[PDB]
Symmetry: none
Subunit: 92 residues, 2 copies
């Protein structure tokens, strides 16, 4: 009771994870804001089938790596190299 953070273990699908992102220190999605945001929960994808992730969730951590004040590539690299299960910490 009283936590803005969610831990979501997304199971990789045949077609990948099925969501898009934007943000980072080198790619701010908002003014003075370097957070990584989920921009699309793609139909047919695993994030949709799971049903827990929502658009404009802030990606706080991918597995064991925090995504706060990082370059956009840092989070892309962590998502592309994910295993069969990826642990996403999200803030709302």
């Amino acid at each position: 009771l009283g936590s803005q953070y969610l831990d979501i273990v997304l199971l990789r699908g045949s077609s990948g994870l099925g969501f898009s992102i934007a943000g980072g220190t080198d790619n701010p999605h908002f003014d003075n804001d370097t957070s990584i945001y989920i921009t699309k929960v793609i139909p047919g994808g695993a994030a949709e089938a799971d049903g827990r992730l929502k658009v404009y969730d802030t990606i706080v951590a991918v597995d064991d790596q925090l995504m706060e004040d990082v370059a956009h590539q840092v989070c892309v690299d962590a998502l592309k190299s994910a295993g069969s299960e990826v642990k996403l910490r999200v803030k709302r």
Copy 2:
């Protein structure tokens, strides 16, 4: 929307690198070609219009929608001392 960026190739080349393509898709299955790095002090940075993670839509009037990575590299390398880049973001 699209922006047409004409760049003069410098000592160090165009001053950026790319990733993506039909044979190197993004983790969300996007096959677009996009700018991965802008080299500080390079041609693209000094021009000031290109930004990292810009999607390359065309190179010297050749569309880069749904193309293999080396197609776009080949186009960038063969465009000569002046390159017309169409980008979207």
